[PDB]
Amino acid sequence: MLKVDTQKISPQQVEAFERDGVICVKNAVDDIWVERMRTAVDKNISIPGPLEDKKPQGSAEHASSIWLIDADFRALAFESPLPTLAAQVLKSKKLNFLADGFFVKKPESNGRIGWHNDLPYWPVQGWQCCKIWLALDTVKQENGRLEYIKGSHQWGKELRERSNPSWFIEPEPHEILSWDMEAGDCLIHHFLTIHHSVTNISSTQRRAIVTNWTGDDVTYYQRPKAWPFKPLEEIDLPEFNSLKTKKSGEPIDCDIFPRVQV
- Rounded Cα distance, 34 and 31, in Å: 5
**Restricting to residues 49-88, which ones interact with Ni ion according to CB under 5 A?**
none
**For Ni ion, which is the closer residue by CB, 194 or 254?**
194
Q: Which of 125, 96, 131, 103 is nearest to 23 (CA)?
A: 131
**For Ni ion, which is the closer residue by CB, 147 or 254?**
147
**For Ni ion, which is the closer residue by CB, 25 or 192?**
192
**For Ni ion, which is the closer residue by CB, 33 or 191?**
191
Q: Burial of 151 by CB count in 10 Å (0-12 exposed, 13-18 middle, 19+ buried)?
A: middle
Name the minimum Å distance from CB 189 to Ni ion. Answer: 8
Q: What is the DSSP string of 120-169?
A: GGSSEESS-EEEEEEESS-BSTTBT-EEEETTGGGG-----TT---TT-P
Name the minimum Å distance from CB 116 to Ni ion. Answer: 6
**For Ni ion, which is the closer residue by CB, 191 or 257?**
191
Asked whether position 147 contacts Ni ion by CB under 5 A, the answer is no
Q: Using N-to-C axis directions, what is the helix angle for 11-20 and 82-90, rounded to 10°?
A: 70
Name the minimum Å distance from CB 242 to Ni ion. Answer: 26
For 245, residues 6+ apart whose C-beta sits below 8 A from its C-beta are: none
**Restricting to residues 99-138, which ones interact with Ni ion according to CB under 5 A?**
118
Size of the site for Ni ion (CB under 5 A): 1
Name the minimum Å distance from CB 250 to Ni ion. Answer: 26
**For Ni ion, which is the closer residue by CB, 61 or 118?**
118
The identity of residue 81, as a single letter, is P
Residue 114 — φ and ψ, nearest 5°?
-75, 175
Name the minimum Å distance from CB 14 to Ni ion. Answer: 22
Name the minimum Å distance from CB 178 to Ni ion. Answer: 14
Asked whether position 20 contacts Ni ion by CB under 5 A, the answer is no
- Rounded Cα distance, 4 and 20, in Å: 29
Asked whether position 185 contacts Ni ion by CB under 5 A, the answer is no
Binding site for Ni ion (CB under 5 A): 118
